[PDB]
Design a protein around this ligand. Structure first.
Ligand code: CHL
Ligand code: CLA
Ligand code: CLA
Ligand code: CLA
Ligand code: CLA
Ligand code: CLA
Ligand SMILES: CCCCCCCCCCCCCCCCCC(=O)OC[C@H](CO[C@@H]1O[C@H](CO)[C@H](O)[C@H](O)[C@H]1O)OC(=O)CCCCCCCCCCCCCCCCC
Ligand SMILES: CCCCCCCCCCCCCCCCCC(=O)OC[C@H](CO[C@@H]1O[C@H](CO)[C@H](O)[C@H](O)[C@H]1O)OC(=O)CCCCCCCCCCCCCCCCC
Ligand SMILES: CCCCCCCCCCCCCCCCC[C@@H](O)O[C@@H](COCC[C@H](C(=O)O)[N+](C)(C)C)CO[C@@H](O)CCCCCCCCCCCCCCCCC
Ligand SMILES: CC(/C=C/C=C(C)/C=C/[C@@]12O[C@]1(C)C[C@@H](O)CC2(C)C)=C\C=C\C=C(C)\C=C\C=C(C)\C=C\[C@@]12O[C@]1(C)C[C@@H](O)CC2(C)C
Ligand SMILES: CC1=C(/C=C/C(C)=C/C=C/C(C)=C\C=C\C=C(C)/C=C/C=C(C)/C=C/C2=C(C)CCCC2(C)C)C(C)(C)CCC1
Lengths: 197, 41, 64, 226, 80, 105, 165
């Protein structure tokens, strides 16, 4: 049931067998204990979901031509009216912070109090209104695809952060620079990712 | 020769032979070559 | 008869002894039923100067 | 088994007497190859040091030989790095070093995992289906796509002869590269110019004549001349 | 005075009583050793704590132990 | 600068609502693995006057007039948290209104 | 030019120190005839002084506000700037010899311990085995790594004397 190997010929860890996204990846023997393994599993799942959300925001700000993700929250610094999808919401920044902190507080308070491992990982019910998880085969297929795209998005978020920390150009500008002259425009040409080129 | 070279093999003579060898090696290095500070070949 | 073989190498697990977790050679084991019948001899002296000591049955096991 | 001897009359180590090896001459006075797969790891280290030394020396002499004959204007090896970098079609040094490091780490990662478990890279459905021939038949001798001409599927007595020829030319190029760096360090000229100097004038063109290799020997010559 | 204690590790070389120049230690019959002897300290109030019995003790650790404290005119070794 | 009464009241109402409707089921479970039956429980026994002072108070364990376990002590603590958060927000608004920018530029 | 230190080739205090040393060295030169042996020794000392000042300069060495050359200790900073010869390469240079002495002492200790009355071997050295191990210790880190993995370098504490606390 393993979905591949992170290295052909690696030592098969016995504590990652019946889990989605199993590549036998870890060589540091992390999550040997079952409870710590489940805690790291749910932490990875919700971290990758937040990585989905962040990558979606950072890409939809580019493909819609509405600006860049980094100067999007600069509206509070200059104190002008914020814009989202050309709607011009009138809410004040302090009200945004208050409603965000109370909404995320109630969300993570109701989420943490499930007190059962399977629904702490995969709750279902109200959070799954489409109901495509009726059969186990498609359910585990979508589990594998979700975990794969989630690990990819977790890499992508740090990629966006490092790309903006190196150069001030947006994501699409960096993609076009690597498309035009990859040998002349990459992470090794800026001279800041690796010391002394 | 065996009876004398058994005494020759004890620690005080070894306390000289290593000392003479290393000391003379450092004297010849500091003599033929001048006093350097940097190992820039 | 009740202790290890004479001349066999044994390990001492007495905590307060100088030869804790060391290897000694059995020189004699008393059969009269005394407190410390297993008498062993060590190659290295202690701080006092002696090289032999006696231990009980539970303080002597074979080293690996 | 044992063929030849690096030093006739010397005491052979016990781990090198009855050992079936490519180019074994009993040359291990330090007894580094006493343990068995420790010698297997150092066999792979010797093979992979020699194979890149073969390509390195051939990349030095053959362009150097053609430079002497005047066919190509390829520069010397020690200044070839600055020649390409200062050119107008130069990939930057940081990009080249990162690409070399990334490509070799992927290659040497497969080579490493082959060493720990032999034949472990032949697991199906890993390298797009062509990893079935990626099983190493011998430590340091993978075969498969690395021998596409079928020059290893021959008689066994010819195989160790080819292995002996590989390690012998491998060691010879390996001391050659040390000579190449030493001769650039002392004379400051390429191996082709140094070879022509020794052929045309052997006595006055010697490492003993140059004061870099043996310091103070030129002062002995000057003191004896005066 | 000082407290002198003898443990069961004693096997009776009857030499700890010779090294003590104060007649503190005495030897009683016993059954826990080959020599059937065991050190005893009847006149423990006359001990000064010179630890010569500890120097004479061959067992590791020592069978006889002398503990300092609560000094008096006899344990301090004053003739005045 | 944000008006003080509305901000303070909103912050303390939000914190009280979080304490009662959200943080209360997670409460009385951390304490149950802290001062529960088989674990630590009472640090003292109670014999003398200086030893009865560490005994629990008389008004903190009576019963629960609220439908949940939200008592007077919890009301005071979550109201203190709400006052703290409201004063923090008001302080940040005051620092912004003075022309001083605490955030990195 | 790191940490506010000028290079030794372009330092005024470095040249002023050189001029001061040449002045005091030439002060003693006036008390001897040029054809004397103390004059030759003083001339050789002055030549060694001039050679040392020349070689200390133009080698990447730097100094600051004192005329006395400074050493850069941080790796990377001593690698991006040409300062690895100060302490970076002497670090591995010392460690090679330091590991050489530790390895040959370990092999001699191991070899002597598998012998009757090994305490005598420490005060009665044997020359052919010690000299053989002395010339068989060039590959000390290669012997050290292989013994580390397999447990021959270390020892489990069940045969190690430990304190009774
Ligand atoms: C690991 C093997 C290796 C060896 C032995 C050399 C050898 C050398 N490199 Mg080459 N290089 C190596 C690494 C690499 N270099 C380059 C590319 C360059 C460049 C860009 C330059 C050097 C040049 C030099 C020289 C620097 C010393 C000198 O004379 O400065 C005093 C030296 C002869 C320099 C040169 O040619 O100077 C004349 C130079 O400019 N190297 C790459 C591509 C990423 C390498 C990858 O492994
Ligand atoms: C790569 C995307 C992806 C995929 C394949 C899945 C797949 C799954 N999720 Mg997950 N999920 C995701 C992203 C994803 N999720 C993100 C980003 C969040 C955070 C908002 C969640 C939050 C979430 C919760 C809270 C729950 C699930 C559950 C499920 C399972 C059943 C859901 C179902 O019936 O539809 C399967 C999924 C699809 C058919 C995907 C449709 C693709 C659309 C078109 C993409 C639209 C995105 C848009 C282009 C931008 C299934 C294993 C439930 C579960 O396991 O119940 C037992 C459950 O409780 N997920
Ligand atoms: C632990 C501190 C320490 C360090 C790092 C050094 C290091 C050095 N000192 Mg110092 N020195 C020390 C302690 C130290 N010494 C002590 C305790 C004294 C008093 C006895 C001296 C007295 C002293 C004087 C008087 C002089 C030095 C000199 C030197 C240099 C000579 C190195 C050498 O032998 O050539 C290198 C040796 C080798 C490469 C050995 C080769 C071994 C194999 C073959 C490789 C070197 C920079 C001389 C110098 O160069 O001045 C800068 C100098 O004039 N030192
Ligand atoms: C750095 C390159 C390198 C490496 C890794 C090896 C490694 C090896 N060679 Mg080799 N050798 C080399 C360069 C190298 N050699 C060169 C340049 C020459 C020519 C001067 C030789 C000449 C040579 C001979 C003549 C023999 C070896 C042998 C050996 C083995 C001895 C094992 C040992 O001492 O530990 C490895 C040592 C180090 C890493 C140092 C081992 C497989 C012996 C053999 O076949 O044993 C299996 C043998 O007979 N080699
Ligand atoms: C614990 C020891 C130690 C310490 C205190 C330093 C300290 C330093 N190193 Mg260094 N380094 C070390 C060990 C150490 N190094 C080792 C072992 C290596 C490997 C050989 C390096 C390799 C290295 C490189 C390659 C570089 C540094 C640089 C630096 C400087 C900037 C550090 C940084 O992140 O930028 C500050 C970041 C703030 C967010 C700083 C002086 C850099 C430098 O010189 O700066 C110009 C640089 O490029 N280091
Ligand atoms: C070659 C034998 C040898 C080896 C491998 C070690 C190894 C060690 N010792 Mg020890 N040490 C030795 C001899 C040796 N010591 C001797 C002879 C003495 C008495 C002077 C000491 C005194 C000593 C003390 C007081 C301490 C150590 C400590 C240490 C540790 C730190 C490493 C180090 O450099 O310490 C520094 C070692 C010294 C300063 C001693 C230098 C004496 C010379 C160099 C040894 C000469 C040995 C000789 C040449 C070997 C014969 C060669 C053979 C061919 C005949 C390490 C486990 C330290 C520790 O516990 O760390 C965890 C510690 O506190 N050692
Ligand atoms: C991380 C560093 C710690 C952050 C600590 C501050 C948290 C609270 C921030 C909001 C309150 C505030 O600053 O109000 C101060 C003011 C808002 O206050 C405004 O003041 C005006 C005068 C009017 O009274 C407005 O009605 C009022 O809303 O903030 C701004 O004007 C811009 C704030 C920019 C930063 C917002 C995000 C900060 C939190 C996230 C940081 C990580 C990303
Ligand atoms: C030349 C180098 C030294 C001799 C090398 C050969 C050697 O050790 O042979 C070994 C011989 C004899 O070998 C002896 O064999 C015996 C039986 O196995 C014991 O092992 C002895 O310990 C051993 O010394 O010893 C010597 O030649 C001793 C050399 C002199 C002592 C060390 C050097 C002292 C230098 C300073 C004082 C003199 C100036
Ligand atoms: C080999 C090379 C070995 C090293 C030779 C080094 C060579 O530079 O030294 C020359 C003199 O210059 C240096 C003098 C020296 C110094 O200034 O540092 N100082 C201290 C002695 C002043 C010898 O010149 C005559 O003295 C030769 C006399 C007889 C030598 C016999 C052995 C010869 C070699 C065998
Ligand atoms: C959650 C996350 C990203 C969240 C992003 C968000 C909310 C983005 C929001 C916004 O962008 C928008 C949309 C628009 C912007 O205008 C504003 C902001 C607000 C900025 C990333 C996680 C990112 C998570 C990452 C990168 C995790 C990396 C983990 C690694 C490397 C693990 C290491 C090991 O694997 C090794 C190396 C070896 C093994 O032995 C051991 C282990 C420990 C397993
Ligand atoms: C009666 C009742 C009710 C009601 C209640 C309420 C409404 C309450 C509220 C409350 C609130 C609404 C609040 C509270 C509070 C408390 C407290 C206790 C507080 C505290 C505070 C503090 C402590 C502060 C502090 C400070 C200062 C002093 C200064 C500086 C800043 C700060 C902030 C730090 C109901 C109907 C529901 C039911 C029935 C009964």
């Amino acid at each position: 049931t393993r979905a591949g190997n992170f290295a052909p010929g690696s030592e098969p860890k016995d504590y990652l067998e019946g889990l989605p996204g199993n590549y036998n990846f870890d060589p540091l023997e992390l999550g040997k204990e079952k409870g710590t393994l489940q805690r790291y599993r749910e932490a990875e799942l919700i971290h990758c979901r937040w990585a989905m959300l962040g990558a979606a925001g950072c890409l939809a700000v580019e493909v819609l031509g509405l600006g860049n993700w980094y100067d999007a929250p600069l509206w509070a610094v200059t104190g002008d009216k914020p814009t989202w999808f050309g709607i011009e919401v009138p809410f004040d920044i302090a009200t945004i912070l208050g409603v965000e902190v109370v909404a995320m507080a109630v969300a993570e308070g109701l989420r943490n109090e499930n007190q059962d491992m399977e629904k702490r990982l995969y709750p279902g019910g109200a959070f799954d209104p489409l109901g495509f998880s009726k059969d186990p085969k498609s359910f585990e297929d979508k589990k594998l695809k979700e975990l794969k795209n989630g690990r990819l998005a977790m890499v992508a978020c740090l990629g966006f952060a490092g790309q903006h920390a190196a150069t001030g150009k947006p994501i699409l500008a960096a993609l076009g620079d690597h498309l035009s002259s990859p040998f002349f425009n990459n992470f090794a040409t800026n001279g800041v990712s690796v010391p002394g080129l | 020769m065996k009876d004398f070279t058994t005494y020759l093999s004890t620690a005080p003579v070894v306390g000289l032979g290593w000392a003479i060898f290393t000391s003379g090696l450092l004297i010849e290095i500091n003599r033929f070559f001048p006093d350097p500070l940097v190992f820039s070949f | 008869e009740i202790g290890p073989k004479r001349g066999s190498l044994v390990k001492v697990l007495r905590p307060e002894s100088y030869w804790y977790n060391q290897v000694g050679k059995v020189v004699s084991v008393d059969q009269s039923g005394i407190r410390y019948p297993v008498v062993v001899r060590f190659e290295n002296q202690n701080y006092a100067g002696v090289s032999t000591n006696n231990y009980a049955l539970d303080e002597v096991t074979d080293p690996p | 088994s044992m063929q030849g001897n690096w030093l006739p009359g010397s005491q052979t180590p016990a781990h090198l007497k009855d050992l079936k090896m490519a180019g074994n001459f009993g040359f291990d006075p330090l007894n580094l190859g006493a343990e068995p797969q420790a010698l297997r790891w150092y066999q792979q280290a010797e093979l992979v040091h020699s194979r890149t030394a073969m390509m390195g020396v051939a990349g030095i002499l053959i362009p150097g030989i053609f430079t002497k004959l005047g066919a190509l204007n390829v520069p010397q090896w020690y200044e070839a790095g600055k020649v390409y970098i200062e050119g107008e079609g130069a990939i930057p040094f940081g990009t080249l070093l990162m690409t070399t490091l990334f490509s070799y780490a992927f290659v040497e990662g497969k080579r490493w995992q082959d060493f720990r478990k032999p034949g472990s890279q032949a697991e199906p459905g890993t390298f797009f289906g062509l990893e079935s021939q990626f099983k190493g038949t011998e430590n340091g001798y993978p075969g498969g796509i690395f021998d596409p001409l079928g020059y290893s599927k021959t008689s066994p007595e010819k195989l160790d002869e080819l292995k002996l020829k590989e390690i012998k030319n491998g060691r010879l190029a390996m001391v050659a590269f040390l000579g190449f760096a030493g001769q650039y360090g002392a004379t400051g000229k390429g191996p082709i110019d140094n070879l022509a100097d020794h052929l045309a004038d052997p006595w006055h063109n010697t490492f003993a004549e140059n004061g870099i290799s043996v310091p103070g020997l030129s002062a002995v010559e000057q003191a004896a001349a005066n | 005075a000082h407290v002198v204690k003898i443990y069961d590790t004693c096997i009776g070389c009857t030499q700890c009583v010779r090294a003590c120049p104060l007649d503190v230690l005495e030897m009683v019959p016993w059954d826990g050793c080959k020599a059937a002897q065991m050190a005893s300290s009847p006149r423990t109030e006359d001990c000064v704590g010179c630890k010569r019995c500890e120097t004479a003790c061959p067992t590791d650790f020592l069978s006889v132990r002398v503990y300092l404290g609560n000094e008096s005119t006899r344990s301090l070794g004053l003739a005045y | 600068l944000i008006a003080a009464p509305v901000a303070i009241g909103g912050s303390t109402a939000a914190l009280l609502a979080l304490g009662r409707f959200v943080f209360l089921p997670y409460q009385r479970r951390r304490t149950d693995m802290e001062v529960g039956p088989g674990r630590l429980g009472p640090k003292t026994t109670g014999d003398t006057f200086f030893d009865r002072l560490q005994k629990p108070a008389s008004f903190v364990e009576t019963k629960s007039k609220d439908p949940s376990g939200f008592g007077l002590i919890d009301v005071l603590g979550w109201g203190a948290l709400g006052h703290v958060f409201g004063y923090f927000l008001l302080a940040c608004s005051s620092l912004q209104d003075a022309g001083i920018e605490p955030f990195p530029r | 030019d790191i940490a506010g230190l000028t290079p030794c080739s372009e330092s005024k205090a470095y040249n002023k120190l050189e001029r001061k040393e040449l002045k005091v060295l030439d002060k003693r030169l006036k008390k001897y005839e040029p054809g004397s042996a103390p004059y030759l020794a003083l001339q050789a000392t002055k030549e060694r002084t001039e050679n040392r000042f020349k070689t200390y300069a133009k080698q990447g060495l730097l100094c600051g506000n004192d005329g006395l050359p400074h050493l850069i200790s941080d790796p990377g900073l001593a690698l991006r700037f040409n300062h690895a010869g100060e302490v970076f390469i002497p670090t591995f240079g010392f460690l090679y010899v330091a590991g050489y002495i530790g390895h040959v002492g370990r092999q001699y200790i191991i070899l002597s311990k598998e012998d009757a009355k090994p305490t005598d071997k420490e005060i009665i050295l044997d020359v052919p085995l010690a000299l053989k191990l002395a010339f068989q210790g060039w590959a000390w880190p290669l012997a050290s790594i292989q013994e580390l993995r397999n447990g021959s370098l270390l020892e489990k504490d069940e045969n190690i004397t430990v304190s009774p606390r």
